[PDB]
Amino acid sequence: MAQQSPYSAAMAEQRHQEWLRFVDLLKNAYQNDLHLPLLNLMLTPDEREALGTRVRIIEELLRGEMSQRELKNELGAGIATITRGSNSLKAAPVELRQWLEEVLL
Amino acid sequence: MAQQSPYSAAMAEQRHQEWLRFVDLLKNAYQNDLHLPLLNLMLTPDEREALGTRVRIIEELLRGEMSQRELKNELGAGIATITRGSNSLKAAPVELRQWLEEVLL
């Protein structure tokens, strides 16, 4: 099978453990109301600003997709209503259709 | 007083709100067991690795300071014990000092 040298396996295992220890360290900082000073210790001012900007970009990407999905579903529902209205008019009883023309003058 | 243009005040207020929204977004992700995929969305693999490495550097800096503080307190306690032992020997009754020399042969 696709294996790897014991050097690369140790580097990947240390990299994994170091990342898990960061996530757990920040989790306990949130539970002790100490996440704000820890983030200032872990991140430079430019890196914190980059993270805030990335949150805005994600919001702008999600809202752009949502409005695009709503526009697609609105046009599809509008077409579905026209086709369903046409079929319902052709399937309607003649008494109803005869009366609908009289209201149209 | 030291004020600032309304442009810079708006940029600083947006920067502040964007950072607060990131901290709150990650806090709710920890409470929903969704912090791991959110961090992968917010951070590239190199940036996550850098954060794990920074946690190890902080541990190595703190342990280096702790062992240096323990070495300083041990040497100070050792000197304090010698000076306190010397004073206690000179303040001891003569009956005790006379007997301590006899045990020394």
Curated annotation (Swiss-Prot), chains A, B:
GO-annotated molecular function: DNA binding; DNA-binding transcription factor activity; sequence-specific DNA binding
Disulfides per UniProt: none
Residues of the DNA-binding region: 68-91
GO BP field: negative regulation of DNA-templated transcription; regulation of DNA-templated transcription
Gene Ontology CC: cytoplasm
Annotated keywords: Cytoplasm, DNA-binding, Repressor, Transcription, Transcription regulation
Keyword hit for Flavoprotein: no
Pfam families according to UniProt: Trp_repressor (PF01371)
Subcellular location per the Swiss-Prot or TrEMBL entry: Cytoplasm
InterPro entries the UniProt entry points to: Trp_repress, Trp_repress_bac, Trp_repressor/repl_initiator, TrpR-like_sf
Subunit structure: Homodimer.
Protein task: This protein is an aporepressor. When complexed with L-tryptophan it binds the operator region of the trp operon (5'-ACTAGT-'3') and prevents the initiation of transcription. The complex also regulates trp repressor biosynthesis by binding to its regulatory region.
Family membership: Belongs to the TrpR family.
Protein name (database record): Trp operon repressor
Organism, scientific name: Escherichia coli (strain K12)
